[PDB]
Symmetry: C2
Subunit: 276 residues, 2 copies
């Protein structure tokens, strides 16, 4: 049964062979393919890519900050145009505005500052997911969306960047992430690990077992400057994925802490430095 990272590598190769030159907002050209999908088993394995070292502690710490609903850059620990819409003095103090996990936990709420009490304000998308999984696991609407923060100033009712759908059958929790664009070199590996981790978390608090992570892309692209390192990455053979262990029984999504998680059996190839 073939290693799932083989799908990611096949996608990179497909884009290098059949992608077309397409310009992005940031000047930089890309090689682009529209519409792709890969499926990663979460059953007794965790799809942290092995053809280069992925910084999983960073992935974890950023996901926890998302889960908190924080809009304070200071709060994002050691592990873009949107800033122009902010005031100077609030920006200086680390206040990002109503972005990222604010949308997950207070979707539609009116933002005051990064220190305001938003309890009870807006839709808690994340708790809605967890609650639906418990009240009706057959539901087809177990959906959570994220917005690129730069979009929120630009227009009325901007589309999401990412739509994440959960699914339950036979005691297994699966997750499908649709992303309108994905950078294959940097973003995608990170997003895979990040949503796979979220799925492990939610499965843990709802008493289910992780099933599959399905990653679907709109504009799947490779920045011109990542072409040569990706060509080299394609020559590396994947190693069996590692396992992820959750180290205590946790009951609410807000109680998880970075120390609750351990990776084991992770044997990646060396780090590839890709330049944003």
């Amino acid at each position: 049964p073939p290693h799932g990272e083989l799908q990611y590598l096949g996608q990179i190769q497909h884009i290098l062979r059949c992608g077309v030159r397409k310009d992005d907002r940031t000047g930089t050209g890309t090689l682009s393919v529209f519409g792709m999908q890969a499926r990663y088993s979460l059953r007794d394995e965790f799809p942290l890519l092995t053809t280069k070292r992925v910084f999983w502690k960073g992935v974890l710490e950023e996901l926890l900050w998302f889960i908190k609903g924080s809009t304070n850059a200071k709060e994002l620990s050691s592990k873009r145009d949107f800033l122009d819409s902010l005031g100077f003095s609030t920006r200086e103090e680390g206040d990002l505005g109503p972005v990222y996990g604010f949308q997950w936990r207070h979707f539609g709420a009116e933002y005051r500052d990064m220190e305001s009490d938003y309890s009870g304000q807006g839709v808690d998308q994340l708790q809605r997911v967890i609650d639906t999984i418990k009240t009706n696991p057959d539901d087809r609407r177990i959906i959570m969306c994220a917005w690129n923060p730069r979009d929120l100033p630009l227009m009325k009712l901007p589309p999401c960047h990412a739509l994440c759908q959960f699914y339950v059958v036979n005691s297994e929790l699966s997750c499908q992430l649709y992303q309108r664009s994905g950078d294959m070199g940097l973003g995608v590996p990170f997003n895979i690990a990040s949503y796979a981790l979220l799925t492990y978390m939610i499965a843990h608090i709802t008493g289910l077992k992780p099933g599959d992570f399905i990653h679907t892309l709109g504009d799947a692209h490779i920045y011109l400057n990542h072409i040569e390192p990706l060509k080299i990455q394609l020559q590396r053979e994947p190693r069996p994925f590692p396992k992820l262990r959750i180290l205590r029984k946790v009951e609410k999504i807000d109680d998880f802490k970075a120390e609750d998680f351990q990776i084991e059996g992770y044997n990646p190839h060396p780090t590839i430095k890709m330049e944003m």
Copy 2:
């Protein structure tokens, strides 16, 4: 190069072989797989399935009614629980409430009745798509969403049922539809034809050529009562897809009429009656 309908047939076969029993809101069991994708070329062909006759005039007429933004059932020509939320006398007169194409043309507007003037109210998702294609064809946000009408009474900020993303490169317009659930027997063939048609329309008014239609599903399912007819459908060999012809030059999406369209070379297998 293999016939694209082969993908749809492979999906049906996959669900029959590997799908699991899953119950749906309507009682009825289904065989379910989470996460699938198929790609249909629109380049000099139109993916109207050939392994059974698809009612394309109905597909066309319903899409035109959507495009109109109509909420009047009477207006939907010859070719569910949500009604319970409506008043008796408005319902009787055919007024469906702020549903279907109302969302496409007046997203977020406050609904009065089916005869009110909504010009200038809400976000015109469809014109926004067309406008972005003309102002920035590289954009990754060329997105239009549809909601299952039954959801709008149920909750604050319900998720979409369908997210449709367009993409432009080299003078070609492609479309990806993500659907959170798809009934393989009835819904999917219809949705394929419907969004492929929309893509032809938009391409025509923006001066592009149709590229690919990508269909992505969350809960891809087969109702228990469709199993035996689908098993028989799987034994039929697809015939080359037909072509679609747009018969005059049309400039605005609202000007299209059912008579502007002709199918040619359509040689389907006989009709399969699938019972909703």
